[PDB]
Design a protein around this nucleic acid. Sequence first.
RNA 1: AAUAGGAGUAGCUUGGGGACAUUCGUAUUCAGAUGUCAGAGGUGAAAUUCUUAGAUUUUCUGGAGACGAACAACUGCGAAAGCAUUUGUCUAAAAUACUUCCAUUAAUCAAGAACGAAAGUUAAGGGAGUGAAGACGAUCAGAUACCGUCGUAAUCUUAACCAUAAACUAUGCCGACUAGGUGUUGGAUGAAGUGCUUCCUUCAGUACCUUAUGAGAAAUCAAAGUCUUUGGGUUCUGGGG
Lengths: 85, 37, 210, 149, 95, 98, 148, 127, 76
Amino acid sequence: SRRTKKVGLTGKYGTRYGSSLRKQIKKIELMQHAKYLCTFCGKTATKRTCVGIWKCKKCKRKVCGGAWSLTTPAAVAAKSTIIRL
Amino acid sequence: HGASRYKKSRAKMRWKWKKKRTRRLQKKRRKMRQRSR
Amino acid sequence: FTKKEWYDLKAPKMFLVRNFGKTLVTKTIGKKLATDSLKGRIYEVNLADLNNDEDQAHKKIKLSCDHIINRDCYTDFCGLSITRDKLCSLIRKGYTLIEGHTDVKTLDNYHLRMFCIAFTKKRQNQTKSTCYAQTSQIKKIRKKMVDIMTAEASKVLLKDLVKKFIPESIGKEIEKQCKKIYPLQNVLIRKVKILKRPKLDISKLMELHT
Amino acid sequence: RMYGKGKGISSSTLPYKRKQPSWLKQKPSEIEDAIIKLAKKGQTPSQIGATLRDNYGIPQVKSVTGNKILRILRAQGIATTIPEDLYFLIKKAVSMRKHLEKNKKDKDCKFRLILTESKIHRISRYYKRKKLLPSNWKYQSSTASALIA
Amino acid sequence: PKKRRNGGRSKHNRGHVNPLRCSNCGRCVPKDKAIKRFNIRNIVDTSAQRDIKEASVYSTFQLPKLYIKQCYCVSCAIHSRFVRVRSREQRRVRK
Amino acid sequence: SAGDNINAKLQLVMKSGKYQFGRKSCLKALRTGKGKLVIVSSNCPSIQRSVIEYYAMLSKCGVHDYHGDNNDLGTACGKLFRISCLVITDVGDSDIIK
Amino acid sequence: PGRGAPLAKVIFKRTEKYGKKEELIIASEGMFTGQYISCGTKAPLSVGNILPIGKMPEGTLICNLEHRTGNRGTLVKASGCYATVVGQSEDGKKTKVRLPSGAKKTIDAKARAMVGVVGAGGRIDKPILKAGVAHHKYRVKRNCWPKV
Amino acid sequence: ELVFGVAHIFASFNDTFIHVTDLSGRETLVRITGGMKVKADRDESSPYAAMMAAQDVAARLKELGVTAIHIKLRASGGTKSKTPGPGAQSALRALARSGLKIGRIEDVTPIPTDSTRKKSGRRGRRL
Amino acid sequence: NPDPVEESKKHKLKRLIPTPNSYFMDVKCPGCLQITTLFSHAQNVVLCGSCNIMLCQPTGGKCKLTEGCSFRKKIE
RNA sequence: AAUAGGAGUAGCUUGGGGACAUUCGUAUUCAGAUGUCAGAGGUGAAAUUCUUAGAUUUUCUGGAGACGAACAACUGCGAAAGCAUUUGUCUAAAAUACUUCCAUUAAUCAAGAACGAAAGUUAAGGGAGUGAAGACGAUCAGAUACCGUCGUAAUCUUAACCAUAAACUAUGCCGACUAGGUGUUGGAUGAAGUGCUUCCUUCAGUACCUUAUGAGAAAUCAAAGUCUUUGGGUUCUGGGG
């Protein structure tokens, strides 16, 4: 936080790799390391344990999700569509 | 001119064109600054 | 050019003349038998010229070719439009245009899309030129217009629905209910389209044609 | 009008007479009892005053009693610490913020949310300047719903 | 100075009025600013109408009307002699 | 409208009713037969909801579904932790029944 | 890691015998542990169910298609990917679907597919950070790199 | 007695096409444009040419045995213009002169029912 | 001059001397058989005190009252 | 309890206010058909261009992107930018009404912040038409232009950004007082067309027309008036080219 001006969480990368790539990495990593709200117990502890899998620690349960975030806009729309029909 | 733009009376060449020439000129000068630094 | 040969255009039992002309069709060759060419094609029929009342010339109906024997094609209903000249004429400024629609199925499993226009009435109490209705009212009218129309379409068979269209009975029923919300004027069904007209039940089609 | 471009002046206009209706039979104790019943049942002072005028037929509490209803509510100890106006505004702002959390593309909701929050801060600053609101107390963006429930 | 009180159009209590495109030069032009002529017109005149009617079936029938709505820009309207320039005072005198 | 109406009732129950929140207390109250009304979120566990409903049915106690989250029922009751389900053990100024 | 997305361990009970039998299915996005998955002709339409393509309503999104019935999900297997049903034959028997390449193809209606989109979507969106990360990728794939 | 065809009259302003067909459209009867009749290879739109084209169509229809026509007028693409072509009136008058029997006449000019963008810059064509 | 004016009351709520437009009415209903004070511009449905059934219909422009019933105007 | 302010409550109040879903129509375009036979496109006038492997033209299916016409206005809403298919959902808004509540909460505001057309940037889609660039044919004294034919980037959506426009009621915003009439949109009050509809009165909007021994340099302006008869409150800006 109160260390770097603009590179923030990609400051560990900072001395290496193109700035635009570090910008692209920053957006993805912000999503990646976020702790999501669990549908199966109501706490914001849901973390990614491997690429497609987001596990709640508290209720010990594996939700399949996107690579860098819990759900794609595509899957939500598909789910919604199926309920709609 | 003044700070205020255009105001074609009789005037001269187009203000937008004068502005185009200066925007192009400022870039050219910025290239001279780049050559320098 | 090469030779072609006239074949008679019949109309269903509901239409008074039952014979609305002759069409020429190219002479037969091997494997392509001209029956195929006669079948499936579409005719723009002006309605008045079948029943013999000139009032109904503002509509046209579309007729498809669905059964042929020898030199005769029986034909079936496929859709309905108002003539453009009449429609443009009906549209008058200072009054409120409402158009409803819904997608619907007919008792005998014919699937249609039906398009119903309506104008606000002139009346004696409008005084000044602006006779536009309020938007909440036209939404209520639009919902009501669709509700009456879907009820009218669903009830009966195809022939009876076509019969309802001709003197515009649906439009009269729509007018009677919606007058209460606000006075209306020419409420017509502008267009009718089939979505899914049955491929099967040729036998019933022939019987309907009679 | 505070923020609106318009300027409607529709409002209450009392009669010139500021004393008791002639036909009234009730003493202050009866009006107090009616207020107590409504208040206890969970009505707030505007709702009580409107109910008293409409349901019970009795206009302005200041005319039929020696006191004014928020004062009476405080005096009988029923009164909320939070005012009606602040409660409704916070709920409205929470409603906008909840909605904005769901739907991020609503610019008008964001604009309204900042406007309403600005009115919340103004009302808070006034109540703090009065002896009404604790010095330590302050509005905060997202905890407010839990705070005032 | 200001020649036109309304700017030659009708944009009051509005930031934008949608463009239509001209029937003549093809330019984009706001619908209030645009010179719109509804134009109810008959297909042919009298000898032609007589001949086609005689050739025609039907005692009842009469030819379709032409419903156009023709949009002119300011240049177009002066160019094809559609409108006059009035006179300075007279530029407020509507038909 | 409906969630708001329920929230007003819950606010009244919080203010002047006597209530008890969470699974173990809620079961104990039902088992006792002290409970007047059980309000269960759909975001409760299937099994936890089912047990409470069975207990309520046996003990002749009404159950009401809450639409909002377990957390939302907690913030509705003015707390920062989830409640999921509560049982009213004395009715407040609340209109829980006709 | 050879597959772009997770596998799902699914338990059925032996129809011809007794006891529990374990399958390996490709995990759909929004799949979860303790999710119930239904498979068959009379199965209800819902995400991750395994249905003949003939029984999909048009414009639905599906994954794990097979080019012939009982070939066991040979098509549409990569992460985040999906096919769309683009038409159903008037006299049945055939069904028209749209491959994740955008290509349209006609298969028999009887052939199965799996409702929804494959897990681990957006994987390609992150750029490759470094040569060691590329090494770790090829270490679980194939002998194919450095690519001179 | 009478045998009816449908006379599509398609006017592009640049030319006036007379294309008569069966009442289904399918199985056409005469193509004659108007521009086919122009012998100077310039100034393509002409009422005279449209009249000659109509006379040829009438000759051909008499040769065929179609004794009556229903008329469908259409001006261009209706995005290009809403104007009917000059020779259209001539084509109509020639059909009237011919002695072929004239049934229902309709406009089917195909104007857009929307407002999607069209040819030339936003300041229009300067021609 | 404005002092003896009588036709000033037509204007907006705030006049030369501001006044309420609103008034009270003594109302009685068939079958209910009870006489009750009620407010022009009341904002809720009002039930009979004798039994349980409704009397007045509220609305924005004054009140919509009842199709039957008789109403005397309250005077001080 | 302010012809101040805020909050409430009420009415099948209102509307192209905002967001999400949904759905329809049409032209256009592509592919699949379909019937023709010589030209069709295009313009000051032609040619480049397309067409006998069947173009243009006719009718039909299926797909696709695009838009929402006519209706539609000296018409509505929006802080401004801006906003027009159908229905639903989530939302906000103002006026009217109020013998509802509060009790001066206000006004305008350096600093700071939000939103902010078109273009531009960056990424994913999508990429039909239109079409900066670019290519030819002309036009012409030449023409790299207007004009014709073709046509990438862009236009469209999502996700970030960018923060300027004659972003103009070229009129800062609030306040009072001045002068009439014709209209007009949203309510409330009364009376008469047949509960509804009309008309009358009245509010908040909103334009126009005429009048200013009012103003101004006049144009014009009911505000730009009530300012050498100069002080209702306040913010911002300018000092010949």
